[PDB]
Amino acid sequence: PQDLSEALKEATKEVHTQAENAEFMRNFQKGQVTRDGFKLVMASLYHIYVALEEEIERNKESPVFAPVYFPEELHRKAALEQDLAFWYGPRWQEVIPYTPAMQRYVKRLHEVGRTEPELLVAHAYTRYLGDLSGGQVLKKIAQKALDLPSSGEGLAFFTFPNIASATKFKQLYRSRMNSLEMTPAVRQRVIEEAKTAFLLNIQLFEELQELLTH
Ligand code: HEM
Numbered sequence: 001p002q003d004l005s006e007a008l009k010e011a012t013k014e015v016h017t018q019a020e021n022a023e024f025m026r027n028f029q030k031g032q033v034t035r036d037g038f039k040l041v042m043a044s045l046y047h048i049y050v051a052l053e054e055e056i057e058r059n060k061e062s063p064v065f066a067p068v069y070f071p072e073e074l075h076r077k078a079a080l081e082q083d084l085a086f087w088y089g090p091r092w093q094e095v096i097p098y099t100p101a102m103q104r105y106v107k108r109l110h111e112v113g114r115t116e117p118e119l120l121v122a123h124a125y126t127r128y129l130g131d132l133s134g135g136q137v138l139k140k141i142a143q144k145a146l147d148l149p150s151s152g153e154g155l156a157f158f159t160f161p162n163i164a165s166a167t168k169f170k171q172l173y174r175s176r177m178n179s180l181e182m183t184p185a186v187r188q189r190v191i192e193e194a195k196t197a198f199l200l201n202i203q204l205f206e207e208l209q210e211l212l213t214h
Contacts, residue, residue, distance in 0.1 A: 004177050004178050004180065004187065004190070005174035005175075005177045005178055007191060008122075008125060008190075008191060011191045011194065011195065012126075012194050012195055015195050015198035015199065015202070018198070018202055019198055019201055019205070022205040022209075023205070023206070023209045024037070024208050024209040025205055028138065028141065029138075029141065031141055031144065031145045032145070033141070033145050033146075034212070035146060036212060037212050038142065038146060039087045039088065040208050040211065040212070041208065042080065042084060042157070043084065043088075043096040043102075044099075044102050044204055044208070045076070045080055045157060046077075046080040046081070046084055046096065047098060047102045047103075047106055048105055048106065048109070048127070049076045049080055049127070050077055050106075051105075051106040051109040051113075052109050052123060052124065053075060053076070053077050054113070055110060055113025055114070055120060056069065056071075056113075056120065056124065058113055058114070059113060059120055063181075064117050064118040064120070064121070064180070064182075065117065065118075065120050065121060065124075067176045067177070067180055068121055068124060068173065068176050068177055068180070072162045073160065073162045073163050073169060074128050074160065074162075074163075076131075079156040079157045079159075082156045083153070083155065083156050085153075086151070086153040087154060099207060099208075100207070101203055101206075101207035101208075102204065104200060104203070105200040105201070105204060108196065108200060109123060112193065116189075116193075118182065118186055118189075118190070119189060119190055119193040121177060121180065121190060122190045122191075122193035122194040122196075122197060123193065123194075125177065125194060126194055126197035126198065126201075127197070129170060129173065131157075132160065132163075132166055132169070132170060133170065135157075135158055136158070138158075139155060139158035142158075143155065
């Protein structure tokens with residue numbers, strides 16, 4: 001369609017379902033998620049966000065990204081640091097896993113940020129908008145299935161404190177995306193990069209499931 005935001009949603013509809021159907025996510029939705037599995041997901045998110053936010057800072061003033069730069073409203077690295085300290089303890093930095101599938105995702109993020117900057121919006125879209133809307137239902141399930149202590153930590157990642165209304169912010173983000181000027185060719189690559197983002201997540205889910213079933 002005309003608006004990039006609409007083009008992306010329509011183009012990734014198929015892969016999004018694929019992600020929902022992934023064995024690991026199927027069980028997650030059914031409330032069948034273990035602490036070992038959740039820990040792996042949080043570790044994955046930490047690595048992904050460190051890379052994404054490092055690249056966003058590199059291109060924050062570029063015309064190809066500036067319109068969608070919302071550091072205070074969206075940054076997740078600090079939240080994930082707090083969460084991992086809870087799930088893996090004070091020495092989390094020395095023990096969290098960094099698997100091949102996680103590395104593959106991180107690798108593509110740095111390549112885009114350093115050599116194909118105009119495609120970074122595809123990754124910011126996939127991660128932030130997804131976690132902002134989809135992650136909200138997953139948080140509900142997680143807490144009810146994790147039966148964790150009342151220590152007030154572990155799920156900060158699921159709360160964006162600097163966003164008063166998810167729907168209102170998501171409308172704003174879409175508008176900003178639609179203001180990005182790109183040639184039809186670039187637009188096509190952005191669409192494809194978004195699909196690639198979903199595929200990287202799907203391959204990650206497949207790897208995590210394999211690791212947990214021994
Ligand atoms: C299996 C668990 C998941 C569930 C139940 C879920 C659920 C949702 C829901 C309810 C929406 C709102 C749709 C709308 O009103 O437009 C949404 C949007 C979205 N999800 Fe998911 N999601 C899941 C996994 C994922 C994953 C793995 C990603 C990718 C990393 C993702 C990326 C997105 C994106 C980018 C949107 C934005 C759609 C738009 O452009 O408006 N989701 N998701």
